[PDB]
């Protein structure tokens, strides 16, 4: 099977949109999504969950899909109680100055919790925060950061969302010189502990700086690694080839181009993360569609491939992350030797 055959008579925009909305459930994403949903359903005291994925891995789409699935799951229940929001997700703001701004973070989190049924809450318990009466929640500039944090905590405990999503969580590490890195995460831990809402942090391998800051943080956080498809194992290479085959069969052209024959080039210019592969294939499909080309050629792919200088940095960062995120039996033996465990 593949793309619908009637799309060939459709204009270029419809075919481009169809390919844009298409997604592939490759095994790595399936495993990561299953683990993420299993953790979300029963956090069991875990204040944090950490999703470390490379650039182009697909973390953001994963967030959208889990948000949609959880909203669909909670939709039938909303008839009984109308004040419950299933999932809230906000992106972390990169600070303009040297310090991650928690006032703006709290403001954006509170804005994202706006609901048309304002009468159900009717009060946030802090002066300066109210409804704009038409479609918005307006916060005063005189409202101090602790007051905003208190209002956000009250709103969270009232709404009790299933999971609080923070995308691009590596922006929390944008802090001044000093040991303030641990405090950046301690504040979020305190917030999640008071509101009792599991916080999901998604980001690149720069998030490894938050991995094992302290004993408490390491205990109450769950590490989820979104591995790329490596070239050292036959299973990963075969999964990459299968993904390439699916994309070949699902891209709307008159004749399906042969891409599995150039799987090495695709891996070279994508490092195995299928999100970058999908993005590059979308680019080349649009390029071919603008001239109504019958098939994809190697020149068309090369005209929009990532530069090798870019991919060198991509691979350096990926290796740096993957070396830290790896574990062997030697680590287990070292742990138990340190412990009283005889083995």
């Amino acid at each position: 099977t593949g793309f619908p055959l009637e799309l060939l008579t459709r204009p270029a925009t419809e075919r481009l949109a169809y390919f844009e909305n298409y997604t592939v459930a490759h095994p790595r994403l399936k495993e990561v999504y299953e683990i993420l949903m299993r953790t979300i359903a029963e956090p069991a005291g875990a204040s944090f969950i950490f999703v470390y994925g490379a650039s182009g891995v697909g973390k953001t789409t994963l967030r959208l899909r889990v948000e949609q699935k959880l909203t669909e799951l909670a939709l039938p229940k909303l008839e009984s109680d109308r004040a419950r929001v299933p999932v809230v997700g906000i992106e972390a703001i990169a600070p303009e100055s040297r310090y991650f701004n928690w006032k703006e973070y709290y403001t954006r989190a509170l804005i994202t919790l706006e609901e048309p049924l304002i009468d159900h809450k009717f009060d946030y318990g802090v002066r300066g925060i109210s409804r704009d009466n038409f479609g918005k929640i307006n916060v005063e500039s005189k409202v101090v950061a602790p007051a905003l944090r208190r209002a956000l905590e009250n709103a969270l405990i009232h709404r009790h969302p299933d999971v609080f999503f923070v995308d691009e969580a590596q922006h929390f590490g944008k802090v001044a010189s000093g040991y303030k890195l641990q405090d950046q995460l301690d504040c979020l831990k305190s917030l999640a502990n008071m509101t009792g809402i599991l916080h999901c942090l998604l980001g690149t391998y720069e998030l490894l700086t938050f991995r094992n800051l302290s004993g408490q943080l390491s205990r109450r956080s769950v590490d989820i690694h979104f591995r790329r498809y490596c070239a050292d194992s036959p299973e990963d290479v075969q999964a990459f080839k299968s993904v390439l085959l699916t994309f070949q069969q699902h891209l709307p052209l008159a004749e399906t181009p042969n891409l599995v024959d150039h799987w090495e080039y695709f891996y070279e210019r994508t490092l195995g993360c299928i999100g970058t592969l999908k993005d590059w294939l979308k680019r080349v499909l649009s390029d071919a569609l603008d001239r109504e080309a019958t098939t994809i050629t190697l020149k068309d792919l090369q005209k929009r491939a990532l530069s090798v200088a870019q991919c060198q940095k991509m691979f350096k960062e990926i290796q740096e992350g993957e070396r830290q995120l790896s574990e062997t039996e030697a680590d287990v033996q070292n742990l138990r030797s340190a412990l009283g465990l005889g083995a």
Binding site: V24, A25, L29, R65, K241, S242, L245, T246, Q249, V260
Partner: peptide, 7 residues
Amino acid sequence: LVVYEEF
């Protein structure tokens, strides 16, 4: 080589 499914 397997035609995977949609997410």
